[PDB]
Write a protein that binds this ligand. Structure first.
Ligand code: SAH
Length: 267
């Protein structure tokens, strides 16, 4: 078994952005990514299927962690899909390990053509799947087909493939009623961007004290990551650290961002 090094570093916690309500730099890292990603999940929970017993279609299911947090908290039945064979496994295994094997089922399926009948689910999700789906139009017309009339559908993903305007076009052009759209760039971060941010934070703090210690502390911090998550992730973060040590990088940071779109199907 060999996992993508992103999956390897996430190490079972979720594959989406961290959501820090009221700003990431504002929070100055008193709240970690590991928790903020769960905050973002709770955010899709709040805004779609608030309802227990209801049924939720998860489009990119990934790890399966966020699905399971929603089926506990809100008491919902879940059907997620993925094309990544190793994601399907992590999610199914996790489902069995929680006693939730009976409500929420995972199936490896291309999201452009869905086996489910029309008007089945009460809600739908796409957490950072749609950018990496190839036929997005088809995928989303399909998801429109899948929901009950009135069912909410909550998408969020990375922006500048697409932009806030272009996503809103994509989703209305499949029939949906768009009732909310938001640029969360201020309030969200990448998993990796966060690990690197902590590293360089504490390194610049240490640097104003004993600069001669910096290399050592860096080596130690990478050590601790290597200890929890395995060496691949440590070697990763080390490299991203080396690249933000160059300012020809500087303005490339915020040239990507995040958005959240809340839609409903008409009654
Ligand atoms: N065409 C497609 N149909 C269904 N899933 C797809 C897909 N293209 C990509 N995906 C899936 O979308 C997922 C994106 S990673 C996002 C995971 C999840 N929302 C979480 O928060 O943990 C991956 O599991 C990938 O296999």
């Amino acid at each position: 078994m060999v996992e993508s090094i992103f999956d390897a570093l996430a190490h079972g916690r979720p594959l989406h952005h961290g959501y820090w309500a009221g700003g990431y730099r504002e929070d100055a890292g008193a709240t970690p990514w590991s928790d903020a990603a769960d905050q973002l999940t709770d955010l899709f929970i709040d805004k779609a299927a608030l309802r227990p017993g209801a049924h939720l279609f998860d489009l990119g299911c990934g790890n399966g962690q966020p699905v399971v947090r929603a089926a506990c908290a809100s008491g919902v039945r879940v059907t997620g899909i993925t094309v990544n064979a190793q994601h399907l496994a992590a999610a199914t295994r996790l489902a069995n390990e929680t006693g939730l094997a009976g409500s929420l089922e995972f199936d490896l399926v291309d999201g452009a053509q869905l086996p489910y009948p029309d008007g089945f689910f009460q809600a739908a999700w796409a957490m950072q799947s749609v950018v990496q789906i190839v036929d997005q139009a088809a995928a989303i017309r399909e998801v429109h087909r899948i929901l009950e009339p009135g069912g909410r559908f909550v998408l969020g993903d990375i922006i500048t493939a697409h932009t806030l305007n272009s996503f809103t076009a994509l989703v209305s052009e499949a029939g949906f009623e768009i009732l909310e759209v938001t640029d969360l760039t201020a309030q969200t971060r990448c998993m990796v961007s966060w690990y690197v941010d902590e590293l360089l934070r504490k390194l610049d703090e240490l640097a104003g004290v004993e600069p001669a210690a910096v290399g050592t502390y860096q080596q130690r911090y990478l050590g601790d990551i290597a200890a929890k998550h395995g060496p691949g992730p440590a070697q990763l973060i080390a490299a991203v650290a080396e690249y933000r040590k160059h300012p020809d990088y500087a303005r490339n940071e915020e040239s990507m961002g995040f958005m959240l779109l809340q839609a409903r199907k008409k009654q």
